[PDB]
Design a protein around this ligand. Structure first.
Ligand code: SOP
Length: 334
């Protein structure tokens, strides 16, 4: 059997699905089916400081040239009338205790995606929250101190993970997406999983950061590109001053930019104050899962496009869930 349940399991994937099914049992709703969570990719990577953060900090020896992270893809599946449906997927970036500041002990959500067919409707949002609470809960226990989310809906016609969302599934605007993360984080705060959370701006002022080198540097994320565009304009300014002399602050505009966009960037403190000082090293009990299809989001979108897998309705998304699963299974074999 190529079913989702039979996919090789993980501490992490298991933790998640256990949490959700407990929550589902407590709800005791006749239409809900069993949920399955599987990490289908885990591998070790680096993020490279782009040129010009490179120039200004790396070469100076003030900041490391790259940071190592593990990357992971996990999908949640619900069983509807005895048939697997993949309604949710997420890609995270985890930076262990073995990683250079600013990035150590931080997790980042690269992207997350869903298709709105989970049943019943009235539990869909709850379930996604639960998945997220549990993830934050898991990495906290491994000793990651801080989660990071950038609340960034996809551009129109663009797919984060699943190819061809249903024409009527609305895409939230930023304010709504913000409120949605807030409602999730409050629940994790009341459960004492999260200490507190703040926008990037407030957080950076509190941490009293004086320099861009201090800002966590993540793959695909906004700030490494902002800094680049900022040095780029910081350079054009210098060239403008160059002319005035007759020749052919970085952290200032960082703070300006941070303030302007602050609402859309979450910093989530899992462990604050005393504990984060001295911690045993981060030990991931789960194995590496090489999977070519699940490294980044583009492989599976290519496959989807190539093989015409759409998630555009419950019936297609199930068929797609089928192929996705078969592939994951045959691509797992010798
Ligand atoms: C960069 C990252 O990946 C991390 S930031 C997350 C951004 N990811 C995405 O935008 C992926 C595409 N979006 C999604 O998969 C979902 O929106 C996610 C983020 C999973 C949320 O799912 P939900 O829990 O259903 O929240 P949401 O979208 O806000 O939808 C709940 C209600 O919010 C309404 N709604 C959503 N977008 C709307 C809109 N644009 N206009 C009006 N109403 C909207 C929905 O019609 C829906 O109404 P109802 O069915 O309860 O009657």
């Amino acid at each position: 059997k190529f079913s989702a349940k039979r996919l090789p399991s993980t501490r992490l994937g298991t933790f998640l699905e256990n949490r959700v099914n407990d929550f589902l049992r407590r709800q005791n709703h006749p239409e809900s089916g069993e949920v399955t969570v599987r990490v289908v990719h885990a591998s070790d990577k680096t993020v490279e400081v782009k040129p010009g953060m490179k120039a200004r900090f790396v070469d100076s020896g003030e900041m490391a040239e790259s940071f190592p992270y593990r990357t992971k893809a996990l999908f949640a599946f619900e069983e509807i009338d005895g048939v697997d449906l993949c309604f949710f997927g997420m890609h995270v970036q985890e930076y262990g205790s073995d990683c250079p500041p600013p990035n150590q002990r931080r997790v980042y959500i690269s992207y997350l995606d869903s298709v709105h067919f989970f049943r019943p409707k009235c539990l869909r949002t709850a379930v996604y929250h639960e998945i997220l609470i549990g993830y934050l809960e898991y990495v906290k226990k491994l000793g990651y101190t801080t989660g990071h989310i950038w609340a960034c809906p996809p551009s129109e016609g663009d797919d984060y993970i699943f190819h061809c969302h249903p024409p009527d599934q609305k895409i939230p605007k930023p304010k709504r997406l913000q409120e949605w993360f807030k409602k999730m984080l409050d629940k994790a705060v009341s459960e004492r999983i999260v200490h507190d959370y703040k926008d990037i701006f407030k957080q950076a002022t509190e941490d009293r950061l004086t320099s861009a080198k201090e800002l966590p540097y993540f793959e695909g994320d906004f700030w490494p590109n902002v800094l680049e565009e900022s040095i780029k304009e910081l350079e054009q300014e210098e060239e403008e001053r160059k002319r005035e002399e007759n020749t052919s602050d970085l952290s200032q505009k960082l703070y300006a930019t941070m303030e302007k966009h602050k609402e859309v960037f979450f910093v989530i403190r899992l462990i604050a104050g005393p504990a984060a000082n001295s911690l045993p090293p981060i030990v991931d009990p789960d194995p590496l899962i090489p999977c070519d299809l699940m490294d980044g989001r583009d492989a599976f979108l290519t496959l989807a496009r190539d093989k015409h897998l759409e998630f555009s309705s419950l019936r297609r998304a199930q068929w797609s869930t089928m192929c996705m699963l078969v592939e994951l299974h045959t691509q797992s074999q010798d």
